[PDB]
Amino acid sequence: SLEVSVGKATTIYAINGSSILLPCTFSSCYGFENLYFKWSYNNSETSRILIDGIVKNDKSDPKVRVKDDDRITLEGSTKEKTNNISILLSDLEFSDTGRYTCFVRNNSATIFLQVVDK
Amino acid sequence: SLEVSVGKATTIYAINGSSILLPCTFSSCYGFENLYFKWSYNNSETSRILIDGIVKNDKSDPKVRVKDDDRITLEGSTKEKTNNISILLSDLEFSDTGRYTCFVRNPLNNSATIFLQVVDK
């Protein structure tokens, strides 16, 4: 049915030492089987995988495949209207400032995360 | 096809005296004809209309119907992969801080939310 979005990208400010939710949802007009998704981190120096996973079908919650940061928790859920593959990043440091890309296969969203003191 | 979103809501910080884009896009697997949309401001006693309009079809850019703030410009466009009905709010003041809602109706309905915080810096 009729869906709305604030876009494929946004900027989030988060507090040093705290946690933050990196939001991403997806949808398909023609269903899906074993959908692959991946969260990655980019800054001007380095790039790396954070977590990836599989959404088996439109009635199964996302499941983690590999994870490269213990501070990350998958916070996904599969419901009638929304396929949620958001992640929680805990114990933030200033070095966590950067671009977070969520890639979905069988498109990409971008979170610009800025870690601040207050 | 395959779409991705950062959600139906976000928070945007903007600078006093400047401008800001309030983003919203919509999608319908069933398509649409003469889709109605409305931007409202919600941190008052009663909600204040900002601008509403119509998207005729998947090949026509959004068009303004009524507008209640001359500081607002529709920045919409209709392309193959994206139905954009964002607006630009110029000449920001601190009183512009609040909740912005973008409502869409297909002749069901849905709504996206922008929490705008105006700061001096």
Residue numbers in the entry:
A (entry chain A): 30 to 135, 143 to 154
B (entry chain B): 30 to 136, 141 to 154
Question: What does the published report state?
Answer:
Voltage-gated sodium channels are transmembrane proteins responsible for the generation of action potentials, and play important roles in the modulation of electrical impulses. They consist of a pore-forming α subunit and one or more auxiliary β subunits. Each β subunit has an extracellular immunoglobulin (Ig) domain, a transmembrane domain, and an intracellular domain, except for the secreted form of β1B2. Furthermore, the β subunits function as cell adhesion molecules (CAMs).
We determined the structure of the mouse β4 subunit extracellular domain fragment (β4ex) by X-ray crystallography. Unlike the human β4 subunit extracellular domain fragment used in the previous crystallographic study, which had either the C58A or C131W mutation, the present fragment contains all three of the Cys residues. The molecular structure of β4ex is highly superimposable on that of the C58A mutant14, except for the N-terminal region and the mutated residues. The N-terminal region of β4 does not participate in the β-sheet of the Ig fold, and appears to be flexible. The β4ex structure exhibits a remarkable feature: a highly ordered multimeric assembly of β4ex molecules is formed in the crystal lattice, and the β4ex molecules interact with each other in an antiparallel manner. The antiparallel arrangement is mediated by the interaction of the C″–D loop of one β4 molecule with strands B, D, and E of the β-sheet composed of strands B, E–E′, and D–D′ of the other β4 molecule. The side chain of Arg94 in the C″–D loop hydrogen bonds with the side and main chains of Ser48 in strand B. The side chain of Asp97 in the C″–D loop hydrogen bonds with the side chain of Asn113 in strand E. Val95, in the C″–D loop, participates in a hydrophobic interaction with Leu50 in strand B. This antiparallel interface is asymmetric between the two β4ex molecules, and can successively array the β4ex molecules in a linear manner. In the present β4 structure, this disulfide bond is not formed at a distance of 3.3 Å. The antiparallel arrangement is unambiguously related to the interface for the trans homophilic interaction of β4 in cell-cell adhesion, based on structure-based mutagenesis and site-directed photo-crosslinking.
